[PDB]
Design an enzyme around this catalytic site. Structure first.
Site, short mmCIF file in Angstrom:
data_model
loop_
_atom_site.label_atom_id
_atom_site.label_comp_id
_atom_site.label_asym_id
_atom_site.label_seq_id
_atom_site.Cartn_x
_atom_site.Cartn_y
_atom_site.Cartn_z
N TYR A 271 -11.21 -1.28 -8.31
CA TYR A 271 -11.58 0.14 -8.23
C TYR A 271 -12.34 0.68 -9.45
CZ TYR A 271 -9.24 1.26 -3.87
OH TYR A 271 -9.00 1.35 -2.51
N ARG B 70 -13.51 -9.26 -5.13
CA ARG B 70 -13.33 -8.21 -6.12
C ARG B 70 -13.26 -8.82 -7.51
NH1 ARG B 70 -9.32 -3.79 -3.07
NH2 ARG B 70 -11.01 -2.71 -1.97
N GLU C 170 -11.81 7.87 -0.68
CA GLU C 170 -11.61 7.77 -2.11
C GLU C 170 -12.88 8.13 -2.88
OE1 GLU C 170 -11.31 3.53 -1.61
OE2 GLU C 170 -9.13 3.58 -1.67
N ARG D 260 -16.70 6.43 -0.52
CA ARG D 260 -16.65 5.09 0.04
C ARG D 260 -16.73 5.06 1.55
NH1 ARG D 260 -11.19 1.19 -0.44
NH2 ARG D 260 -11.57 -0.14 1.41
N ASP E 279 0.77 -1.26 0.00
CA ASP E 279 0.00 0.00 0.00
C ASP E 279 0.79 1.29 0.00
OD1 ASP E 279 -3.00 0.10 0.01
OD2 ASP E 279 -2.71 -1.53 1.45
C1 LIG Z 1 -5.75 3.74 4.73
C2 LIG Z 1 -7.17 3.49 4.37
C3 LIG Z 1 -7.43 3.66 2.89
C4 LIG Z 1 -8.89 4.04 2.61
C5 LIG Z 1 -9.93 3.03 3.12
O1 LIG Z 1 -6.98 2.39 2.31
C6 LIG Z 1 -6.99 2.04 0.86
C7 LIG Z 1 -7.74 0.78 0.56
C8 LIG Z 1 -7.28 -0.10 -0.44
C9 LIG Z 1 -8.02 -1.29 -0.75
O2 LIG Z 1 -9.10 -1.48 -0.15
O3 LIG Z 1 -7.62 -2.10 -1.62
C10 LIG Z 1 -5.96 0.29 -1.25
C11 LIG Z 1 -5.41 1.76 -1.11
N1 LIG Z 1 -4.05 1.74 -1.59
C12 LIG Z 1 -5.50 2.15 0.36
N2 LIG Z 1 -4.99 3.56 0.53
C13 LIG Z 1 -3.84 3.74 1.21
C14 LIG Z 1 -3.35 5.13 1.39
O4 LIG Z 1 -3.16 2.81 1.71
#
Ligand SMILES: CCC(CC)O[C@@H]1C=C(C(=O)O)C[C@H](N)[C@H]1NC(C)=O
Ligand SMILES: CCC(CC)O[C@@H]1C=C(C(=O)O)C[C@H](N)[C@H]1NC(C)=O
Ligand SMILES: CCC(CC)O[C@@H]1C=C(C(=O)O)C[C@H](N)[C@H]1NC(C)=O
Ligand SMILES: CCC(CC)O[C@@H]1C=C(C(=O)O)C[C@H](N)[C@H]1NC(C)=O
Lengths: 387, 387, 387, 387
Positions: free
Chosen positions: A322, A288, A196, A211, A69
């Site tokens: 996504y 997913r 997001e 979300r 991540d």
């Molecule tokens: C830190 C929480 C954030 C929002 C829910 O997580 C996301 C979820 C993700 C996911 O659900 O696959 C991937 C994104 N790369 C991640 N963002 C970060 C900055 O790590």
């Protein structure tokens, strides 16, 4: 000159494929950036696919734990739509493990967040160089959209979240004008959750389907006005559009509060069709896999579960991910209405697959006045790779 | 039209990341130029990262003894910031094993030195072709900045050194106007030493924090005026900013003479903040590991050791290296003051590592009015490579 | 608008390095076109290195018998100077196993000869597409310059040879104006021989130092006027500048007839300095090793052997090859005289080396008013390759 | 501004080579898109080679069953003529397993068909983004030209086929003006068959030599007027130009009905020379080997078998394939007549070869007023590859 994105979104009965990069497949032999969290944003001359590189390529040892991540290597870069996220055609955006971008009719604005979780900084760039900055304001992962931001007559807006990904958090709306931050807003939404977001312009107001990572299987919406006055809640419709999500049968919609007893999610989008809404979602209510988009009647204002159209873009036997929203500038489409478009991230590798790496591919889909036939334009890579 | 770089440098309380190429990591599988001595210089439309190729790529046999410094293969080439120094996106500058570059508001000026040590020549190019030349004047390695040169209203200036890297030497200042050399100066600085200077523009005068390779642990400074009248000495501050260097505790600053009993060094930079100074330096006082930048109060004029800010960019558990200064043209940043920016070279391989090769990665950091949190955006490559 | 190349060549006391591609070295790991017969020609914005690809890359099986000279795969392509002849930055010129090119102040003109030896055709292109054609006129390998052609106020001229490479042949001068052939001339030169000429502009007349492949160790010259009236013979100077060649001691110069009892050669060049001449030549009188350039006093008009300057660019312990002439448009150099520049092809592989392949690297050198120190900027590749 | 393609085609006595990519050969070591169905279309500044990628590269496992024809990975992309279909210089057109393209004097129009056979959609793009759409109208593989479409004063036309590839089908002509469909026509041609047409402009009317896949060894022609009024049938000439085809001896030409007892074919082209016709065809009457082009006297209007010129471009010992027509905009060629040009696809691999993959190379040939000598500019790759 500045791009007026005041018009309303066009009304579509279906979407047609814009492009498909085949980044991973191609990545089996070529020099492609192992990435994730991809998205499309257009300027009045071209659209580009923005991504987040893991600071490495595919079929390389540095592709290893790229499932992590956040890291210091991830940087926001971009390429013309359809083109894969390759090194030799890649344009450097910003240092980021979470970004957002948008053009305004002159130059490209980008915002890349990076650094430590408890003090991450969001560096905004304008014209190929950073102009302003934002420091984490709640010491818990300063993250943003992973989707195109919105510009309306010189002022680009976007949303950010600082707090835990699970329980309550702090959401804000940022407004700028040439890389420079010109005012912001705190979003009161206790019990609610925003992450997001996916926005697009519709009548001089910015609409985002975000979300809820806390207690939401139904996604949250928020209409932003040009003077930071806003409006927030969840997309009404008696149909949940998050993953994991409960069934539609046992789900009552709610224009006001989150619904469902699930606590995770994935990034999605949705468009306001008059009162109707186009909502994307993974076929699978659990994993997913697969991507689909339905149009529920009056679903933007009522707890509706009455659909008039449906269409698949990735069957349930193929990895999804996504989804984001953006629009085709009138100066490209030639319309007199902002053509609604979207993309689907197709993640391959860990966790659902046995590979040392993790990346993703995307595909772009746009408005259209005709109804477009169900089908699947899935990733296509044959895993595992040479490693 | 010509770029007025007359304004003063902006006052920053901290720096934000501009970019990160990940050249080496990427270089593990892609076609990246094995290089070293990288640096950033901007034009009024974009900034580019200039480097010095070893005439070869990474993970190749021709990457071998690339620790040698000078050779006939090294050539100065450039790419847009953030992009790695790759072959397919690379622009050829000049034949050099020591270079410097700068734009002036119209065309790019480059100066690449190459040839034998006892008679090396510095070929200056303007607009993509050599316009004037300089022959070694003291028969001992004609070398230059390895950093961006300075242009102020059509006249670009830079500094060069001819003599031994250890004891005394001969330093000169060169001034040009469209690739053509228009006057120069001899710098009297006996007992002193100047190498690989870092300059930037501040009030129509060129400020450079150079490298005393003789007897300096404290770095030398030199303010150049538009008519070659100059001023020279060392950065005052009671803190040494060279490597190897002695501790801060047992170090008395000196606006006049070199201080410390060390005889080597590395390329660094420093900015004049009113009277205060931002000074970069490796965390390690001995090796080339970690990078940090402090702001000592009144340290540009007094033997001060009073800091008000500090910030790390590469922790002491990661390879550091060279550092340079440049500025964001007002025509990019939009400010009314020259935004102060800098870069850090991250060298990997020999000597501190077991590999047949030696190269480096870089990261760019710019002004900012806010204070930016400590962190590390280190190289990231996993050595040794496939060889 | 059209480029006036009427001015005289500038007077240089030495040449400075322009660039060096390191195509082969780089070609050890990157995707570089195995080529040969490279050359530089500039437009009023940039110079590009034109080459002849063997329709394949290096370190590949298709690199095999690329020593064959002519084939249907070879095509003329180009890249900005210094850049190696790589696929991803390559621009397609014409289908050719023998070409020539030149800009005129608007668009690029190229002429690529290909096809069977007894009926080869020379396809001329203008602006990225063929405009006129020339059919072999003497059924024996219709070949041309392998060097930059000359444009003077909208009219570009070049020379071609049709006949045996050994004994007598038929030489012609072609003149065009926008890809379209506008008149030509037959060159009477019985006993004489002309091949792969090197031209440049000097006072509205085109000067070329060609290659006598028949009985010439001393090279032939030919001044072409704008109305096809011409003048031909050999470069006077009492010094031979071809390879293989006899010694200088036992060689009497001849402004009129070929001299020496050798029957081969290599492509070379020479510049007219007033009456003096700069003449390039391989250090070795026998093999294709090392490259040097001397200035014989009054050697353009008298059987002189009086040199005032010399300078090496590739020592005799390194592979040399072809050499060509061109000029830096005034619109780039900024001079009021056409800066004289040249390049050296550095061939590696068969025949002088044990490899399945054969290719070459180049380096560019330009005018300069100062004298530039001897040195070597040789190829650098380590053969044999992975094969 | 809009491109007037009203002029008549120029009259040529032969064709000269424009380019040759060597995609496959190069593809042995470089990163080239495994493709097929390539074609050239020019704008008033450059010509580009459009192709159909299999969503993968050469010498890669994803190159496998790329003989399958249709799939979700294939996307229409383009590169400047001569350049191979490589990833790093590739421009993304549209998602397609069957496409067509053409410029109009301003922006590029592309039409890519994809999706399921029973409901495929043809997405038209204009300026780098989809503007209109066409849904399969007869539920049986909505396919199109695989050749350049025609634009005449802002209106671009093309042809499409929906129905079985064998027996009867449904053909239509589409007309647009800036990505937007402005009227269409149904082609009555019972007993006849039209597939993958090759068109070009000649006197404000669009001429196409298509492919009868049903019962045609002689190809069909169709002249389209600016108001959808059309004219259709077969190219008269007493010579068949399809493959498989019967001999010329036992073949009577027919300006009206299909002739021959063969039921397959390949894509071809033909030009109208006054009444005469230039017709391309594979040397082999059975396999896809060799390419040749003849000019039959009065063959566009009479059952003629009287040729005055012939010329080969690929001898019968080398793989041939598809052929297409286009023209050199007057704004490039400078003529006062549309220069007739064409390309030849050179397929390698399955079925005629033992390889896991299948792709193809191309070569471009243009008008010319002189007669050009027979020769072969065949693919050149050495199969099988590393696999
Ligand atoms: C830190 C929480 C954030 C929002 C829910 O997580 C996301 C979820 C993700 C996911 O659900 O696959 C991937 C994104 N790369 C991640 N963002 C970060 C900055 O790590
Ligand atoms: C020759 C002395 C010079 C200045 C001290 O050395 C530099 C120090 C270097 C170093 O300390 O790592 C590397 C530079 N590549 C080198 N410059 C040249 C031209 O070799
Ligand atoms: C055919 C004679 C011609 C001029 C002497 O030969 C050249 C000599 C060459 C050489 O001496 O190395 C290489 C050139 N590739 C070749 N030209 C062609 C067309 O093959
Ligand atoms: C479906 C019939 C169609 C026209 C005859 O077939 C073509 C023939 C081909 C061929 O004869 O080689 C290859 C083309 N890729 C194919 N088009 C599609 C869409 O598959």
């Amino acid at each position: 000159t500045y791009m007026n994105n005041t018009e309303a979104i066009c009304d579509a009965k279906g979407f047609a494929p814009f492009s498909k990069d085949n980044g991973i497949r191609i990545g089996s032999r070529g020099h492609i950036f192992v990435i994730r969290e991809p998205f499309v944003s257009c300027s009045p001359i071209e659209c580009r696919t923005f991504f987040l590189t893991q600071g490495s390529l595919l079929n390389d040892k540095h592709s290893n734990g790229t499932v992590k991540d956040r890291s210091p290597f991830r940087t926001l870069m971009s390429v013309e739509v359809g083109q894969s996220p390759n090194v030799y055609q890649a344009r450097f955006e910003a240092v980021a493990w979470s970004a957002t971008a948008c053009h305004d009719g002159k130059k490209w604005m980008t915002v890349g967040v990076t650094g430590p979780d408890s003090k991450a900084v969001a560096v905004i760039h304008y014209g190929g160089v950073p102009t302003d900055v934002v420091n984490s304001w709640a010491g818990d992962i300063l993250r943003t959209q992973e989707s195109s931001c919105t510009c309306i007559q010189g002022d680009c807006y976007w949303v950010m979240t600082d707090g835990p990904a699970n329980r309550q958090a702090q959401y804000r709306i940022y407004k700028a004008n040439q890389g420079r931050i010109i005012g912001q807003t705190d979003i009161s939404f206790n019990g609610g959750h925003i992450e997001e977001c996916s926005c697009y312009p519709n009548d001089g107001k910015v609409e985002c389907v975000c979300r809820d990572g806390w207690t939401g299987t139904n996604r949250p919406v928020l209409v932003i006005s040009p003077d930071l006055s806003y409006r927030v809640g969840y997309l009404c419709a008696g149909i949940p559009s998050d993953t994991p999500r409960g069934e539609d049968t046992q789900f009552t919609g709610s224009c006001t509060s989150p619904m469902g007893n699930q606590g995770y999610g994935v990034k999605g989008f949705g468009f306001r069709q008059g009162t109707d809404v186009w909502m994307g979602r993974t076929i699978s209510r659990t994993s997913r896999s697969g991507f689909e988009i339905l149009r529920i009647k009056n679903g933007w204002t009522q707890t509706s579960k009455e659909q008039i159209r449906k269409q698949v873009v990735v069957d349930n036997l193929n990895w999804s991910g996504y989804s984001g929203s953006f629009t085709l500038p009138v100066e490209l489409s030639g319309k007199d209405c902002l053509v609604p478009c979207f993309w689907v991230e197709m993640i391959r590798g860990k966790p659902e697959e046995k590979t040392i790496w993790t990346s993703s591919s995307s595909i772009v889909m746009c408005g259209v006045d005709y109804e477009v036939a169900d089908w699947s334009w899935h990733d296509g890579a044959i895993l595992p790779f040479d490693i």
